[PDB]
Amino acid sequence: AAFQENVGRQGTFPHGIDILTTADYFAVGNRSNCFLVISVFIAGFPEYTQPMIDHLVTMKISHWDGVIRELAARALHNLAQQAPEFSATQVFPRLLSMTLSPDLHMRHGSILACAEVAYALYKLAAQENRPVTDHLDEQAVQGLKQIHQQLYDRQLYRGLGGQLMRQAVCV
Amino acid sequence: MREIVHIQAGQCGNQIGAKFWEVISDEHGIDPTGTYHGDSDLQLDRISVYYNEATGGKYVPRAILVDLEPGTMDSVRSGPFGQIFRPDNFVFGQSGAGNNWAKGHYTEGAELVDSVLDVVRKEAESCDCLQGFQLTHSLGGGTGSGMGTLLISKIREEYPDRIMNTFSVVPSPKVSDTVVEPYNATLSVHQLVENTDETYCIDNEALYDICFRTLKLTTPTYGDLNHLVSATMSGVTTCLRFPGQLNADLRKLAVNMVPFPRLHFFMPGFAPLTSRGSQQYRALTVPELTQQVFDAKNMMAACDPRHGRYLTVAAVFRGRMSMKEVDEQMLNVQNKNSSYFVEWIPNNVKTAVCDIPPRGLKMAVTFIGNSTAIQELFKRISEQFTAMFRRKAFLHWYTGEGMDEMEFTEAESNMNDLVSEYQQYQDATA
Amino acid sequence: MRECISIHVGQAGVQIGNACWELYCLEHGIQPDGQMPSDKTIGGGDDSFNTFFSETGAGKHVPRAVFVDLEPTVIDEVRTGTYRQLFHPEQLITGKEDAANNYARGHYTIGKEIIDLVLDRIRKLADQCTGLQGFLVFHSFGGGTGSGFTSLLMERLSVDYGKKSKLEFSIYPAPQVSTAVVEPYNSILTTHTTLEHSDCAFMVDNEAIYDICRRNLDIERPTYTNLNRLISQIVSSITASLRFDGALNVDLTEFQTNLVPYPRIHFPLATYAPVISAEKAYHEQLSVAEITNACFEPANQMVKCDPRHGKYMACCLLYRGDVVPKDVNAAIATIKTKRSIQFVDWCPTGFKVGINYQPPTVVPGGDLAKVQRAVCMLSNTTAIAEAWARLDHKFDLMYAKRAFVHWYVGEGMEEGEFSEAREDMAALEKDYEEVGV
Amino acid sequence: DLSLVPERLQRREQERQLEVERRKQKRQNQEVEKENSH
Numbered sequence A: 001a002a003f004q005e006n007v008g009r010q011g012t013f014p015h016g017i018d019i020l021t022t023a024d025y026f027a028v029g030n031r032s033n034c035f036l037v038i039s040v041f042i043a044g045f046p047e048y049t050q051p052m053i054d055h056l057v058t059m060k061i062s063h064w065d066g067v068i069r070e071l072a073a074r075a076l077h078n079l080a081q082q083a084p085e086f087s088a089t090q091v092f093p094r095l096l097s098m099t100l101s102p103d104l105h106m107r108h109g110s111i112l113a114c115a116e117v118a119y120a121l122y123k124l125a126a127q128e129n130r131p132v133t134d135h136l137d138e139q140a141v142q143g144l145k146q147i148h149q150q151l152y153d154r155q156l157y158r159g160l161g162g163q164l165m166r167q168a169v170c171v
Numbered sequence B: 001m002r003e004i005v006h007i008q009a010g011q012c013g014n015q016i017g018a019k020f021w022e023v024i025s026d027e028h029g030i031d032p033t034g035t036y037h038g039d040s041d042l043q044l045d046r047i048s049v050y051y052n053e054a055t056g057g058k059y060v061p062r063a064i065l066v067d068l069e070p071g072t073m074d075s076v077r078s079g080p081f082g083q084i085f086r087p088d089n090f091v092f093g094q095s096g097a098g099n100n101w102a103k104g105h106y107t108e109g110a111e112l113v114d115s116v117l118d119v120v121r122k123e124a125e126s127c128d129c130l131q132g133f134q135l136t137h138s139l140g141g142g143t144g145s146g147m148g149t150l151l152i153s154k155i156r157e158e159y160p161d162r163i164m165n166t167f168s169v170v171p172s173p174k175v176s177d178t179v180v181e182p183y184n185a186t187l188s189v190h191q192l193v194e195n196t197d198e199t200y201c202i203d204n205e206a207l208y209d210i211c212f213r214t215l216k217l218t219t220p221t222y223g224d225l226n227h228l229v230s231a232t233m234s235g236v237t238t239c240l241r242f243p244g245q246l247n248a249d250l251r252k253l254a255v256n257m258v259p260f261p262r263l264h265f266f267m268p269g270f271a272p273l274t275s276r277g278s279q280q281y282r283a284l285t286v287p288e289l290t291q292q293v294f295d296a297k298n299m300m301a302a303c304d305p306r307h308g309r310y311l312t313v314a315a316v317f318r319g320r321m322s323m324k325e326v327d328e329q330m331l332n333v334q335n336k337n338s339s340y341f342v343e344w345i346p347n348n349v350k351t352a353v354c355d356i357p358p359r360g361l362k363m364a365v366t367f368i369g370n371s372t373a374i375q376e377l378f379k380r381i382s383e384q385f386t387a388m389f390r391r392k393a394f395l396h397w398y399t400g401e402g403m404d405e406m407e408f409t410e411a412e413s414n415m416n417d418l419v420s421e422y423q424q425y426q427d428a429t430a
Numbered sequence C: 001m002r003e004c005i006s007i008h009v010g011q012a013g014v015q016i017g018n019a020c021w022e023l024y025c026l027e028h029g030i031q032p033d034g035q036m037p038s039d040k041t042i043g044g045g046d047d048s049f050n051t052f053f054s055e056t057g058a059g060k061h062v063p064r065a066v067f068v069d070l071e072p073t074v075i076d077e078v079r080t081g082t083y084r085q086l087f088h089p090e091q092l093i094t095g096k097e098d099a100a101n102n103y104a105r106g107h108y109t110i111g112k113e114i115i116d117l118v119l120d121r122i123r124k125l126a127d128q129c130t131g132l133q134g135f136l137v138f139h140s141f142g143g144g145t146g147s148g149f150t151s152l153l154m155e156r157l158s159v160d161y162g163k164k165s166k167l168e169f170s171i172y173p174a175p176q177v178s179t180a181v182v183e184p185y186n187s188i189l190t191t192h193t194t195l196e197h198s199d200c201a202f203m204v205d206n207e208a209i210y211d212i213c214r215r216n217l218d219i220e221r222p223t224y225t226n227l228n229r230l231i232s233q234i235v236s237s238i239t240a241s242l243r244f245d246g247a248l249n250v251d252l253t254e255f256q257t258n259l260v261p262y263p264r265i266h267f268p269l270a271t272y273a274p275v276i277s278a279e280k281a282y283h284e285q286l287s288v289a290e291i292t293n294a295c296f297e298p299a300n301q302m303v304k305c306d307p308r309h310g311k312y313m314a315c316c317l318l319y320r321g322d323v324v325p326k327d328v329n330a331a332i333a334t335i336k337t338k339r340s341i342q343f344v345d346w347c348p349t350g351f352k353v354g355i356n357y358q359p360p361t362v363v364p365g366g367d368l369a370k371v372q373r374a375v376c377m378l379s380n381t382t383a384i385a386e387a388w389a390r391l392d393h394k395f396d397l398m399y400a401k402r403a404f405v406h407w408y409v410g411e412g413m414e415e416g417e418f419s420e421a422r423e424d425m426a427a428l429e430k431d432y433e434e435v436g437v
Numbered sequence D: 001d002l003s004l005v006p007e008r009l010q011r012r013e014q015e016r017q018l019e020v021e022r023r024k025q026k027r028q029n030q031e032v033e034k035e036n037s038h
């Protein structure tokens, strides 16, 4: 409602009509649509690609609920095909440093985000008869080959908290 | 643990809540003004379990009237005992929820839960040690179901270790004529099994059949339904309002009547059956009361105890009588009707006696059972739910408010798995 | 000279300790306030009755008890009762939340918050004693608090005072007086926890007391008030050696040496005779041979067992009244020549006779009459194991269906504890059966 | 005295003690320090 008011009374919001016709009182009702469908439509423009992904990576992925974390991971996956360079150069390394944090939920969210980014980059490269290593530089290949090994070095797979790390490593 | 906060959502819940308060006040001698005027010390030995002491030796209730519209909120405040409650304990909106669970659980309810959790923490702050909660709502109405189940979840998320007890009133097509009540009922169950600890099943079809066939009434009204619901509430809580060793607190009652986490639905019963403006001079004996309390006709649910197996049974006899005779009658009933009792939970029938019979009756009897036959109350709901959900009828009301078919699928699955578990436990070691 | 420190926790435990203390002072002549006119030495304490009582420089004879409750209910009765001036405010500990019949909620939740308080009181009281024998703990298997907090206190004492005995007087569950369906689980748990922390524990079958009250005393509905008055008499008769100038079981180690041959087999069988109602007081006086023959009758036994089927390991008797050693010896010889009492092949087969010339005593207005002579026979019989057998019948039928198990899982307690306790009980039953060979 | 009891019971007691000690050791090894309540 605030966005609609700002677009109707000021008309200075970039792509106000588009983000107002797709996101309305009815379409916004669904959370899955807002996190996967409407999200990609709103991020299609260059004025909402960086901040949206930044907020998804520095907040939603580190939520206190597994459902919200999975939703943020799926949103990042869907928004990883509108920004391959930004997802493979500024967000992927950003996640490699957070996968080693002491927090359990943060580690799980970072692992999920890294897996989703890798899957999206592979899907994008498959549509151009090119390998996935082109987008994921040697830096990415190293960290990804160190997620499971480092976790076992800190007996992090033990306990209830270790069960979520085991599931994340399996995924 | 010595103070219990009372809550009531929806019109039926508020009405059922106001009737129970009036009954326990008339039984304790608390006149509408708030001063004690009874004639027994036991009435004051356990008065702090539901009331609060205030200047002038007054007993202020500890309830919280909650609604989304103002009708029921004005009806209770203006009732014969309406002045008893607190003026700042009435929290309601203006539009209602229109028989929609979504509107009452995600919009108006989600907005008024803030103020609701303000009065709730106000009552918990005036409690030396909170013991639990006792909500009174219905599973048919939208506001009564949605926002009330939203208050159970909020309390379970806030207060970590506190017992949760509710008096769910299952609707019935015979009373109401609204089509979206099957959906408003199923979803509620999906919450209770995963939120509430104790829940009493008060089917409306059973009350209608008892009022139309037993009490002889051509047009049973909502005044007759509240006359049977309040008596049941006064009978099932007689142990918490007076001295006792069996179930003095809510934790003990839960531990004794909840053999499994998901299985905690107790069908209540009370005898002798009476109606408004009727005085039975004949005083039934103890054997007659024990035989009538176990009869399916005196059950508040539409389930026959004979077509099932008992798990936990608790009987209470209110009236001047002998304990040896009651014990002998209970032993005889357990021996004769032994096939209707699981043999894998030894000593699963408790009996208690009280020296404070209800008003207008010299001899009363109560029955809180945990038989697997209660599953029948859900199977009926299942048929309606499935029949209405397969063709997609009136579904836009839910999907258009944030909900989706996934929730209905989840609730249907949870309810269906609760029926299978009941059937399995009923045939344990067959 | 040595002095003991008694402890009473729970509703059943404190209610029995109150009657025991009332009966103890009733016999010692100690007035309700605490003044003892019979005591001529002020400030000094070195008599037989000083084992359970201390003395202030005013005269007051304070008990050596520790009344701990997790809820303000039973403690208030004794605090505003008749012997509230007998105990001190510090010795009357009180909590808030109740365990609500749950060993886990009392051992890993609401009991780990007040254990330190009870331990600081058990250290301050012991500091005022030159010599300590052990600890007489009173609890009940039915109450979850008596199974959790009592076990925790026993475990902590085993580490603190690792060289002191710990005699016990547990209370066994009965359906005619019970209010919980989970009393077998907590009972088995506390039994498995205390099997490795006690030396001699006497059981009290509530069914036996109910039958004795309904038959002998002729009571229609025996209540907890009448049961406490009948169990207190036996508790006093058992501890009469630790409070009078006798010659048998004068110390706590004597109990373990004369009634506990196998460390794990420490559940003797107690009996008391006679038990005549107040109406039939001045009617007939039974001789020693009359109260010694009835002791063997299952009707008077404290546990519903059949000692005739099994054998005995140790036996002793404590008299109270004008009893002659020659008459007791003649009665024992007659019973041995008549009854076919069998003993274990590797155990000594003799009766430890100990007469007390003090006459019995009963509380005024009580259902028990002032008999001229009474006797308390303590014999370790294998038949008592049967009392545990039926208990296991209540643990396999329920535990098989996983009934009432979530209450312990959600309270921090693990699930393997039940299996460990069941294995321990099975091993104890196997040992009992092997001893019968 | 313990000498009065035959060795048949002493051996069983020692076996049970060893078994419970091994079980406690296994439970302690399986436990996690970052998840205890005490």
Ligand SMILES: Nc1nc2c(ncn2[C@@H]2O[C@H](COP(=O)(O)OP(=O)(O)OP(=O)(O)O)[C@@H](O)[C@H]2O)c(=O)[nH]1
Residues within 6 Å of the ligand: B009, B010, B011, B012, B013, B015, B016, B068, B069, B096, B097, B098, B099, B100, B104, B138, B140, B141, B142, B143, B144, B145, B169, B170, B171, B172, B175, B176, B181, B204, B222, B225, B226, B229
């Ligand atoms: N026994 C009984 N049932 C009632 C009563 N009032 C309503 N009901 C039943 O409750 C259901 C309707 O719910 P309401 O209580 O009207 O709903 P609400 O909580 O007011 O919710 P909204 O109507 O959506 O604002 C139907 O099944 C009615 O038959 C009452 O006083 N007694």
Ligand SMILES: Nc1nc2c(ncn2[C@@H]2O[C@H](COP(=O)(O)OP(=O)(O)OP(=O)(O)O)[C@@H](O)[C@H]2O)c(=O)[nH]1
Residues within 6 Å of the ligand: C009, C010, C011, C012, C013, C015, C016, C070, C098, C099, C100, C101, C102, C106, C140, C141, C142, C143, C144, C145, C146, C147, C171, C172, C173, C174, C177, C178, C179, C183, C206, C224, C227, C228
């Ligand atoms: N003989 C006897 N038995 C008692 C007495 N009080 C309770 N019991 C029995 O003890 C069992 C329950 O123990 P309680 O003492 O009530 O429980 P508690 O130890 O206070 O435990 P929580 O309230 O659960 O914390 C039941 O079998 C009762 O019948 C009593 O005074 N005497």
Ligand SMILES: [Mg+2]
Residues within 6 Å of the ligand: B010, B011, B069, B096, B143
């Ligand atoms: Mg309404």
Ligand SMILES: [Mg+2]
Residues within 6 Å of the ligand: C010, C011, C071, C098, C143
């Ligand atoms: Mg208690």
